[PDB]
Symmetry: D2
Amino acid sequence: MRYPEHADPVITLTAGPVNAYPEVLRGLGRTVLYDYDPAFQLLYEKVVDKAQKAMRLSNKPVILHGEPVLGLEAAAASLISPDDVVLNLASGVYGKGFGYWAKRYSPHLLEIEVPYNEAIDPQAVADMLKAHPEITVVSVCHHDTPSGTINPIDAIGALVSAHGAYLIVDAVSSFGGMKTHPEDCKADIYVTGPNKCLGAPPGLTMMGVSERAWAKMKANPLAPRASMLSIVDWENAWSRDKPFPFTPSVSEINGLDVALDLYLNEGPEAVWARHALTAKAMRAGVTAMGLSVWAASDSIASPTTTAVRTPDGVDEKALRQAARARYGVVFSSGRGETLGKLTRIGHMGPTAQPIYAIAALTALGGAMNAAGRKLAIGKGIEAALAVIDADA
Amino acid sequence: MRYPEHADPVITLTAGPVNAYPEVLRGLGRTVLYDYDPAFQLLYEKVVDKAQKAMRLSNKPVILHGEPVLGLEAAAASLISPDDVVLNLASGVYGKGFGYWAKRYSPHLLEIEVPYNEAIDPQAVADMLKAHPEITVVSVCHHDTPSGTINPIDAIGALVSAHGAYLIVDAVSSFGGMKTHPEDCKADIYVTGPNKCLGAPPGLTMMGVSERAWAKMKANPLAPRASMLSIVDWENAWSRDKPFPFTPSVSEINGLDVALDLYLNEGPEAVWARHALTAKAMRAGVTAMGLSVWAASDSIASPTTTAVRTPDGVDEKALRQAARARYGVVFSSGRGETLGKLTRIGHMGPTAQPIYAIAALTALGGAMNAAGRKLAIGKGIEAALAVIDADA
Amino acid sequence: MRYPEHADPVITLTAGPVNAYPEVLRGLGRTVLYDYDPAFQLLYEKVVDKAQKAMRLSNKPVILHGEPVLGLEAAAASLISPDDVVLNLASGVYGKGFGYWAKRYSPHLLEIEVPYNEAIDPQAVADMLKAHPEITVVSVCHHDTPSGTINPIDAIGALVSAHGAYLIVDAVSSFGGMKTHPEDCKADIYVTGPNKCLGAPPGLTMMGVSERAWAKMKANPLAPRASMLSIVDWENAWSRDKPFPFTPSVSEINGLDVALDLYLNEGPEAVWARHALTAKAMRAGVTAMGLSVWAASDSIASPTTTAVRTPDGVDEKALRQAARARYGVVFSSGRGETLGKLTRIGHMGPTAQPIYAIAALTALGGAMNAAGRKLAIGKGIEAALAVIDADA
Amino acid sequence: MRYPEHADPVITLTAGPVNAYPEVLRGLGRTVLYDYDPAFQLLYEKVVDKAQKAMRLSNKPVILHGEPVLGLEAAAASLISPDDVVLNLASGVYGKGFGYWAKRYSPHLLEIEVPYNEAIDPQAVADMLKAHPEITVVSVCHHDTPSGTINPIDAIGALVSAHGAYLIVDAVSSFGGMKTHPEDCKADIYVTGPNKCLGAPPGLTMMGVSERAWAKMKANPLAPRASMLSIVDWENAWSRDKPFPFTPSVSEINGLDVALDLYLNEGPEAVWARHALTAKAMRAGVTAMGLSVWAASDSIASPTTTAVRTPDGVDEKALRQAARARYGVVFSSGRGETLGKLTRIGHMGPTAQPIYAIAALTALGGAMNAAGRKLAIGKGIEAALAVIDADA
């Protein structure tokens, strides 16, 4: 049998979007209220409170009403002034990408760039900060998703703080799937969204903003105002007694309310543990069947996405097509520099269950062997299962 | 009895958000696909084709992934450059407000302004264009929702076209609820969204873009690129064979698919008729009970919102609060310079059914008489019902 | 305009089914678990607990897996033995109807029957019980819905208990819309369901069963066993540690879970008060416009349904057709003896909001006047609104 | 990690209930209409027509409003009278169980019984009919779910027809998942439901009834009338111009409408192929890892359920508990005389996709090896995948 391209797949095991939690799908269909209805104003306030609790935040996170690329661009537009000296950290497609936004708001850009399967060495950051005391803003991506690798943002953040500089973090593809919070890395702007590990659809930004960052942006006359890119306009909009700059995405808010309920109710630690175990099992299965994990070492491999290097002579696009057509299972391509060079299996929210690593490994193995490889698929499943049983 | 503020209302009869069509609420909970899944790529293309059909467009409309203020700001940012002289037409809050974005992107701003219960006079527009050959861009709002009034954008669009200028039209709160389309008014940029008459929640923009606007925007060095504010980035994103600039709002696209299906299957003309009839019934009831429609004349009054002038002396905020606490019925306040001046009752998509005019009339009249007025509520119901019964 | 018969109506204002609460519609789409899954076994136990709390019950109510006609037939089949002498009370279509089931299980049937717009006089019941001391079982319908009238079941129940007899109550169309509970009327079997005032779809029975009734049925060798009609087989099925006689309606259970949440959370007293106020307003509007409430006196009129007598020369079926085609509003016909003689407006769960009485009155008036009546429709709305405002 | 019993599982891979198709979960939340609303009357008729098409029926199937045990009991109660001599065929729990209802409605019961891993032998059936001209009714179960085995009902139906007897077929767990229809097996009463392979929840019965069965049931004074157990009451209820004996399960009808659409649109043959392929893959994996399929032979093994014999010595209950606690995967126990003897993995509607066989194999093998077995799990996955890859 074959699954046609026009029809739904059986399992989406991508690095996001994945199908949302079923409770969230239902939550998206909640009553759409007028945004100035007193019941919605109370709801919105409560959703901000739930976000604050989930993000372990000492102050209110800001919800912005676009998918997290809005928070990332807006953070650059608001926190980076033309006299700032920005140090961008790039270990992948998104990290490198952020440097273009920094360059938009300040002409002074320093960068540390490493190969796109490695992580940023905190010591290289320390060295650069010593060499360049004029640095005022540092930007970093936690999980550079097209690579399935993790940067040590907490150790980086402590150094940035040591040098009196501001920190911007992209935690879009990491928050909720591992232990990470604005406080943990001393972030001044920490950008995430519910559309990766939190198992909601794209549409909203969750942004932690330090009191120091508030002061800086508010004093910046170039910080966007009366703009979709404005953070400062949203400063008090959490409050049931205050207006919204423009109409909030009411249905996405209902979905986020549910996503947060699920996370808080399951218990964030339990949620992180199942992501990490699923990815661990996946990596063990990948290695045991005769494939290689992309990341240069296992210690920097993401618990929320496994990237698998494409063997020579293997068309990565035909591989993904074959996994879907044969087995109903969808994986992600790479992006930019990793496009064509690896395949990505997400472990995110509802897909972060070890049984899905088993399903992923089988579909991946199957498609590889269809392409003429001779993978030990059984050995792979057994290695992944040994990982799961060892944790039991 | 009284309805708690924290509790959900009975009927939301605002000028938007209103509750989405029940089908759209379910559509919102459809499977969330990977955006690069072939079934999603095909869906996305066929949603643009549905929008193209609904908008009677000769070319593809652009869907942008923010609620339509994004379209308005992006249209300014991309089309207007400092070489342009902009004529902004302002008969209300949104028309006036567009001039502020116009002024952000060119220092040359001409305006025609009328009080916020009137419409722009096409003869005034013709006279202004003749007197100012230097005008290159004209902006206009079709239904300036906070006043519940309509501008003659088709006659205006034709004058503007003869002049040789670009037309930017805000049709957010009119499209789907009355006869209007980009090529009816020769619009270069026509911004609408499904969050008013089409009965979907806030979060997407549907934009008609003329070939001439494409060329102007793509030439402009100051037009947003690699930005949430970018129209140009999204030009080819309709195609199943092309990437998305950033992750589309998958659930909102699902809701929009359904909303377009509903509109196209019911028949646009039939849909416009029931908005007009609901509104006509509303105005007749308002007048008969002893209130005044805000609009300077009945001929410019919107078929998708009835604004009702607050009697001098009546506290409009307390009135709306009373309509909800007593009757469970929610109305919109005015906005900006109409706030405190009028109450608004939307007739939009699911609420554009004449029986909701009856409910609205009784709650508004009920609240008014509790504020000490002495309205002829029964007379008002009978006049609205005569309009319903007369409908040939 | 006209609403076609094939398409959805705008408002269903029937005596049931009405559209379910929106939370319940969503609840129906909850994950369907295996019925022997430990999570479902816990859920089922919890839903029985919620039912017990809502019904003010000292022991566990039994959930049966068919709409309440199952509970009614099964109560007759299990509680009425061939040597029982049954006194059936009939003030309408359902009360009279129950006598046929009693006659199925015992040849000894006494009846008190009154006209189908009146209620049972508790004194007539007292008189009959004195005249017939051999009576062992008494059956009564609380709200004989096709008549929109209420029997004094608490006063009847105290008398039945005084004479040592068993009481069967049909509270299908009353429980949840007024103060009524198995304990209140001393019922031995009290049959209701969530498909009227509780605002869920048809599919389940909620049955209060006295310890005395348990003893009787269990000792009855004719009580259905290994049967859809069995009550005794379900005795312990509430328990997470016990099997289900056959597969429970898992989705209906999810809907009931939500329906009960809504009722308990709103507060049963507040729920009863809004039903009673909506019906009161309706009756006042009916009388003021020149129509007559069916019930022989206002004191026996149901708070959960208003029945309106059809004027001479008026085709009741054409009337309902006209209300739906003109205004999008659906009413119920009568049944049996009341078919053709009255129209029924339910006030049940989500339709038990006074604004819906206003909508109902207008549609009813409108259709009457289309049929050549000359109703004072305005006066009707004003009288209903005066009722609502008097309660404010 | 471990999955809490109170918490929802990851994958329900039982022999029913399984989670409904996502479309069906949404269908369940469609508008609940008044059952005498013309749009509902029309819906109900068109759902019977869809069922008629799906069942390849020459006449209307009857929908009964209880889960299919209602159909089975009603079929006995209505068709079998004490003049009948019944031959009940029992190869498992449900076949044996039907004889108990047969014996309730006629004292004359003949049986052919085989052990609960075998199928009925048609030659034995032919021999029995020849030896007993007095047989007038024959009962048979197609897929006796607790054994995961199939009877040759088409050959049996033909023998029974030649004899001159009535055939009652239980196809609850086979219809929709393999080639079977009332007129394939000359069924007089063919009972199925959408709660297994059609992927809807429990609560409705779909019954094919021959014209001869109609005449026999309608003649029988002991056939249930004015009863939940009545087939005859529901004869004309398909028609939009006819009443319902009692209130139909409106939401379940909505779910069924969707389930029929899915089945008919996918194409029944394609649907049967994917159940067969999933099951074939499952059996191959079970055998390769070192377990035994319960069925006496592969040829009688069901394409909609694989029963796996518990190794002697293994605690089957603890095993299922372990598969859920370790892997989040839920299997069915056996029932009655198969309880403790085997574990069941359903391949039904949404779970009939070969990738779920892979997940099931890994969880079952995983649980077994935790119970001390030494299965070749990888071998098992590779054998199941060879079957998937071989599928021409």
